[PDB]
Paper text:
The [name]-[name]-2 translates its genome into polyproteins that must be cleaved to release individual proteins essential for replication of the virus. Given that [name] processes the majority of these sites, any intervention that stops this process, such as an inhibitor, would block viral growth. The crystal structures of inactive [name]-[name]-2 [name], with the catalytic Cys145 mutated to Ala, with 9 substrate and 6 product complexes were determined to sub-2.5 Å resolution. As in previous apo and inhibitor-bound crystal structures, [name] crystallized as a homodimer.
We used 12-mer peptides, P6-P6’ (with the scissile bond between P1 and P1'), in our co-crystal structures. Six of the nine complexes were solved with the dimer in the asymmetric unit (in P21 or P212121), with both active sites in the homodimer occupied with the substrate, while the other three had a monomer in the asymmetric unit (in C21). In these cocrystal structures, both active sites were fully occupied with the noncleaved substrate in essentially the same conformation. We observed that the substrate peptide was extended along the [name] active site with the scissile bond (P1 glutamine to P1’ residue) positioned between the catalytic dyad in all cocrystal structures. The N-terminal (or non-prime) side of the substrate had an antiparallel beta-strand conformation which was conserved in all structures, with the substrate residues and side chains well resolved. The binding mode of the C-terminal residues (prime side) was more varied, especially beyond P3’ position, and lacked full electron density. In addition to the fully conserved P1 glutamine, which is stabilized through multiple molecular interactions, the large hydrophobic residue at P2 was extended deep into the S2 binding pocket in all structures. The sidechain of the conserved P1 glutamine was also extensively coordinated in another hydrogen bonding network. The volume from P4 to P2’ is highly conserved between all of the substrate complexes, despite the variation in amino acid sequences; this high conservation reflects the specificity and likely evolutionarily-constrained regions of the enzyme.
Numbering used by the authors:
A (entry chain A): 1 to 303
B (entry chain C), D (entry chain D): 205 to 214
C (entry chain B): 1 to 304
């Protein structure tokens, strides 16, 4: 038993991480087969970053302006192109450590592992959720751009996030691996703000089920609510409404614990109205929303 | 306050 | 900015994980050079785990009773021996993925990364602290025994933990890689209980420095305290006494933030006596004690 | 209640 914020093993991703340098600007790239993917602002100097015209900046670059290092080996760039907010650098060598992989786009509420990297070298791994306002609450310093987020399924790495920048509130923003931003943000150093965030309700319920599977039962009660009566409380407490698909996704956990989804919703309602009364759930004094139903099943059962 | 692009400096 | 529970990249350890099966009992092993290390209760049946005599149980085994699998490849066991609570299975193939490594025992209050595995296959990675009572608060199911905990420094993996078992309270217990238990525990399915735990004071202070570095300052105040006056409060709240050595270790974080350690102790005293009054620190409504000073510096400075 | 050794079943 036990329940922890748990990342996927990072080995398959570590072997893809490279360093990309343009002038004095450096960040991380993702080397898959003979292409290195990285955030396009590597072609910015410091003075370029407030109002870059990336088309202009890139046309003035040639292949030899891109220094790509895989460990100590320098990879020769033989072609380059811009796709949205990422650069694709064709290199003369295919990564012999390329895993089976997919590029995927995730939706708010889903989770992924981040391999934080600096100078092409992996530094650490942690778990993240994409917030309803499309930001992520990561841990990123200067040099971390190009670090990637990912999920692993049966030795296939699904890359879902590439890191670009930090908003003034201290949260983080990035793109999918085709360079499309998550959220209404652009890659320049301007005043930008995310939309008002909300709490991921289905994830809170999934984590309450994890707590029950692990023997925390003190928040359970005899009541059951309706999907509509609950959503009224949800909107009052800045929680996302619960959908029927959410109720259906919670099916395996409801059946495992024998606690109906709407039975659990009455626990959540009580916790939102009255708090925890000095008690904790799975070691937390706050309601946790960065575990999906899949995360709970993966960890509380099997592997 | 402004966004910080998080490339590094060499 | 930001602060997360952050594990070391696990790739160097993933290459060492194998499956070890004896009869119908299976768990994970650690394959380094030509030895596979694993918990010795792999040689138990369910009937054996209440009151095993492991010396007898191992004499009744032979090399061929150990099925060792690295992925799809079966490794041939050419020797077997016991070292405390760990089995050492000599195999005919050295692991080509063996990293530079050390077997180190860690101190209570220190942290490490756990690579949880089942059937020799890594499933996930997360950070743990060795609690003052020598348990860890992990996430472990049946089949996870033999998962290891480690830290990485340069290219060197320092293995510090091998997982064996779960106590009735739901906390976890295991050994160093020489098979010596952390804490007053034994590998048998008997009633056992850990001593009373305490909160790791120096780590709580480290995390408060993390919070200041990240812009949480509401708990700061102009007051200061003496080490002895603080420890009087710490003892009342089941916190570990603070030592001058702890103060020394916090020196770099103190210098960086400009908050003297005993000033930050005055903040901690206030939080212990008054709570947070509905506020949070780094997203937490509880005082976090599973980050060491080194963990804070590593993450707030970007060590690779 | 007793300790649970966390080997698995083949």
């Amino acid at each position: 038993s036990g329940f922890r914020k748990m990342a996927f093993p990072s080995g398959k991703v570590e072997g893809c991480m490279v360093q990309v340098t343009c002038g004095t600007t450096t960040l991380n790239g993702l080397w898959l087969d003979d292409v290195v993917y990285c955030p396009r602002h590597v072609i910015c100097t410091s003075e370029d970053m407030l109002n870059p015209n990336y088309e202009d900046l890139l046309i003035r670059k040639s292949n030899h302006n891109f220094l790509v290092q895989a460990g100590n080996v320098q990879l020769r760039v033989i072609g380059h192109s811009m796709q949205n907010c990422v650069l694709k650098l064709k290199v003369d060598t295919a990564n012999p450590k390329t895993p089976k992989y997919k590029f995927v786009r995730i939706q708010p509420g889903q989770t992924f592992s981040v391999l934080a990297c600096y100078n092409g070298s992996p530094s650490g791994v942690y778990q993240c959720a994409m917030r309803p306002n499309f930001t992520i609450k990561g841990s990123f310093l200067n040099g971390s751009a190009g670090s990637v987020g990912f999920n692993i399924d049966y030795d296939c790495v699904s890359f879902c996030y590439m890191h670009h920048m930090e908003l003034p509130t201290g949260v983080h923003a990035g793109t999918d691996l085709e360079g499309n931003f998550y959220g209404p943000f652009v890659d320049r150093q301007t005043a930008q703000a995310a939309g008002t965030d909300t709490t991921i309700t289905v994830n809170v319920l999934a984590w309450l089920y994890a707590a029950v599977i692990n023997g925390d039962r003190w928040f359970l009660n005899r009541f059951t609510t309706t999907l509509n009566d609950f959503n009224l409380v949800a909107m009052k407490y800045n929680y996302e409404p619960l959908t029927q698909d959410h109720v259906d996704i919670l099916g395996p956990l409801s059946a495992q614990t024998g606690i109906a989804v709407l039975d659990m919703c009455a626990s959540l309602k009580e916790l939102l109205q009255n708090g925890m009364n000095g008690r904790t759930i799975l070691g937390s004094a706050l309601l946790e929303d960065e575990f999906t139903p899949f995360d709970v099943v993966r960890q509380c059962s099997g592997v | 306050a402004t966004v910080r692009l998080q490339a590094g400096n060499a």
